């Protein structure tokens, strides 16, 4: 329809065009981007598509990338929510355009979304993750793509030309470099392009930010719940090939190409289903293959590299949700269900703190169970979990993205950092895990707005101010109203430091995002980890 | 008047009679209770007074004991109130006793007040320990000692038989002794004895809990303000030595150790008291040179040890920190401070403070203090980092001490009662920003509002009648509020788990819970983890 045909320096595409309760939008999915990662090219860097005749098929999503599946609560609506819906291949590597309607005559800024789930899991495809209403509220260009996870993107034997580390990375790059060339031809302007993305897709934005040959290929940055300078976001040579090698045997096998044919042939089920045994003790939020400090992609430790980077004029928005932390327990903390209250007892709390932080000396532990229990009330299970719920939050998420965010600021990046405080009424988890890691998609993506759907009519209302605030931002590198009329949205700075919650009543501006338990994680606890 | 003649096992003893707005009492003041240690006594256990002809004049109050005189702010009302009133001598072995002017016929009960002061000062004939307001306002017995301070009773060669330490605390010990024998001829029941002390005497008291031949001589305690546990209030062997010898020195002078000893025997008091302060480790407040000593003698083992490690059924404590106890101290050497302005420091003053005020403690367990105690939204705020210093050194020293104690002690079969003393007098000459600062509760559990002469509100003296009684009631019954009363606000008993301590100000007492928790949890159980391992 002029508007569902286009060219790509690859070849011709076949568009789809899309139903919005408030207007249309013109939509590209599964867009190859590269030649497939397969057989020997497993654990390899991705190579750019080859050109194409004729006119590929762009109406549908294509497969998800080889994954852990979450076999936990099997068909609970928010647990199911993120898992893949589409075929599981190797052959994964496409992303989607989304473009308004018509296609707009000026060059429009482009958001590009990375996703989420500890680079174990996620898909560019999920429910959640619907261009549509946000292409179409506020036309903007936006592109979301697929990347390798688990042991096909991140397996590393630092050193080998076998399994070089970090490809699913380099998978998000080819993806933003078929970005600058190509979605000129959507609208879309090469050079205002903002990436977001959340859990470890916050982490990736972050890690862009941090390695050059990325950091040409965007301009503004939102990192949402995730930071690369997260505890669980990377891991350095020493144990990235420890664990490989552990998978190796762990799968029979078998020196160092040896190793890799040698396992390049397991069948893919099998990796994924030894994935979780190379950890290397008992954990809730730890992944066993992420991005690794191999000395290339990532140049240096991302404390190091974030102590004394280039900032200057980046505009960054970072957020976390009201209660990171829960969602997490659920997963192999002693006496944590959805179903129960979950109250529990001192001596589970104790295990549980070895097992939200993990692999620290006792001297450590005991320090955290200081901070975190109220020796007030030791006891009380109601405390003692939203207390384990802090613990696992604060040192994860939040405190690394405080920390993120003031060290940005004060080389002179224009930081806006909110806490997104508000529980949807759809909400399939417990009352008690409060508003847990990443039910704050949903709005930003403008779900409320189909309205096949439940939400409150307030919280459509919501889900447009937000859209609004993450257009603008993408726009002109501010969240706020392009009039003195509502409350303002201060910068975050490293002194002042100043967030707003987003909920249903309008902006509140508060100081110190979690500031007492940041002294801890962030200043003291590395002090006490390398005196002992 | 016949009513202040008395005949004491030693001899005959002539009182004074004291007038009251409401009554009159009996005072007996200088009873001598050791011969004098002097010349080849100094440094030695004390020897009970033998009886003597004639009648002692006790109308007066005798001799300070020796001590270094505080001159920060000199005439100053809020530092010389606590300066010695009477004579420096090495002859200070006297008692008094304070009894209601029928004398008793009934056996009544007895209160024996043990002076503060960090083991180097104090007397108990200051004005602010006087007997008549709680004895003629609760027909008891009250008897305060006075004990050897500074190297002259705490000096300790340890293991050697010239300085064997700890004769302070011995010199308590016998009054306590002449008390079973003698306080009967008074009205004082020899049985139903309450020992209270405030700071160095506080946990004075607490080392006669812990010390099994003292352990027979007192019934109930209360410890106000400082416990024997606290980090300032004990000694070991090892630093001991380290620093009778470094006084040795600095004073001139030399089997060994003997000839140390007899050559230190020959000083001048005075001399020795010129030396004293030269004789610490490094720049600290709250730490005091000659202090009871770990020597396995008359503490068994660390008192903290031994208060774990210990049965405490049948014994009825009465403890209790006031507001702001870490203020009065900072005054005396922490950068930035002063009664005389608003001692705002800076937070580079403050990271300085917090080595003075903790002292010896590598630079990660200081960094821990930092931690806890920063504001970290306001780390640069003068008024808080000025609460907050104050906090550190009032937490460390005094409080979490106590805190932990109670703990231990109520977990273990005492019953324990906590307050929290926090009216600030009308009368204060600190500042303000002090708040009610250490010591300042005394005056009113000694019922001093309702002297005449001091122009204390009449709502004070309400006050002060009020404690007296939760005093003397605990005194009585190991229990301090009215027994025959559903009706009044309760005091409850402290306890491991629920931590209650009342309120003891102008309102009618108040629960709360928790007795600095957060707090205590880092310096009682953190902290020994921290500095144990590093
Ligand atoms: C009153 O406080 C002031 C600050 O407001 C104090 O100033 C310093 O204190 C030290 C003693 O701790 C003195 O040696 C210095 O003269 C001062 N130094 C600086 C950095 O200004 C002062 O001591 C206090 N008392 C007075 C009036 O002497
Ligand atoms: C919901 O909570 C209960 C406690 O209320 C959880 O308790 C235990 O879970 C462990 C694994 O962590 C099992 O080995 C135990 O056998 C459980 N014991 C108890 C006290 O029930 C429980 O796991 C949760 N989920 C449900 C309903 O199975």
Redo the contacts between chains.
């Keep these: 329809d002029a508007e569902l045909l286009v060219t790509v320096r690859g070849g011709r595409l076949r568009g789809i065009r899309l139903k919005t309760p408030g207007g249309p939008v013109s939509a590209f999915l599964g867009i190859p981007f590269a030649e497939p990662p397969m057989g020997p090219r497993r654990f390899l860097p991705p190579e750019p598509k080859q050109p194409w005749s004729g006119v590929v098929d762009a109406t549908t999503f294509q497969s998800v990338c080889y994954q852990y599946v979450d076999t936990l609560y099997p068909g609970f609506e928010g647990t199911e929510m993120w898992n893949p819906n589409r075929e599981l291949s190797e052959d994964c590597l496409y992303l989607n355009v989304w473009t308004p309607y018509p296609r707009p005559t000026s060059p429009t800024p482009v958001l590009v979304w990375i996703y989420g789930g500890g680079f174990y899991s996620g898909a560019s495809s999920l429910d959640v993750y619907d261009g549509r209403f946000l292409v179409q509220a506020e036309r903007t260009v936006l592109v979301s793509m697929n990347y390798r996870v688990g042991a096909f993107g991140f397996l590393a034997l630092p050193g080998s030309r076998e399994a070089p580390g970090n490809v699913g990375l380099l998978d998000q790059r080819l993806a933003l470099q078929w970005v600058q060339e190509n979605v000129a031809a959507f609208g879309g302007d090469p050079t205002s392009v903002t990436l977001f993305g959340e859990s470890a897709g916050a982490a990736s934005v972050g890690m862009h930010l941090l390695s050059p040959p990325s950091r040409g290929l965007f301009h503004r940055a939102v990192l949402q719940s995730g930071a690369p300078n997260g505890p669980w976001a990377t891991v350095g040579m020493g144990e990235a090939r420890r664990r490989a090698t552990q998978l190796a045997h762990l799968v029979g096998c078998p020196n160092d190409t040896e190793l890799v044919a040698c396992l390049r042939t397991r069948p893919a089920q099998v990796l994924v289903n030894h994935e979780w045994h190379v950890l290397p003790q008992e954990s809730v939020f730890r992944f066993s293959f992420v991005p690794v400090v191999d000395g290339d992609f990532l140049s240096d430790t991302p404390e190091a590299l974030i102590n004394a980077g280039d900032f200057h004029g980046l505009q960054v928005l970072v957020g976390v949700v009201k209660d990171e932390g829960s969602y997490f327990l659920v997963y192999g903390a002693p006496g944590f269900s959805k179903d129960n209250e979950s109250l529990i007892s001192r001596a589970e709390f104790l295990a549980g703190v070895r097992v939200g932080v993990p692999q620290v000396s006792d ?1 450590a532990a ?2 955290v169970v ?1 901070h975190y ?4 009330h030791p ?1 009380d299970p109601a405390r003692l979990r939203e207390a384990l719920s802090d613990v696992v939050g604060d040192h994860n998420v939040v405190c690394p993205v405080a920390q993120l965010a003031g060290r940005l600021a004060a080389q002179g990046a224009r930081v806006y950092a909110y806490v997104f405080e508000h529980r949807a009424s759809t909400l399939s988890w417990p009352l008690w895990m409060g508003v847990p890691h990443g039910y704050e998609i949903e709005f930003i993506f403008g779900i409320p707005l189909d309205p096949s759907r439940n939400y409150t009519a307030e919280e459509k209302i919501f889900a447009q101010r937000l859209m609004r605030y993450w257009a603008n931002f993408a726009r002109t590198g501010d969240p706020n109203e392009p009039d003195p009329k509502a409350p303002q949205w201060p910068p975050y700075t490293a002194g002042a ?1 100043q967030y707003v919650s987003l909920d249903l009543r309008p902006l509140e501006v508060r ?2 995002l979690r ?2 338990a ?3 994680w962030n ?2 606890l590395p ?2 980890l390398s ?2």
């Design positions: 001297l005991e320090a200081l229990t109220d020796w007030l006891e430091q100081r110190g500031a007492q940041c002294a801890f200043r003291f002090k006490l005196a002992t």
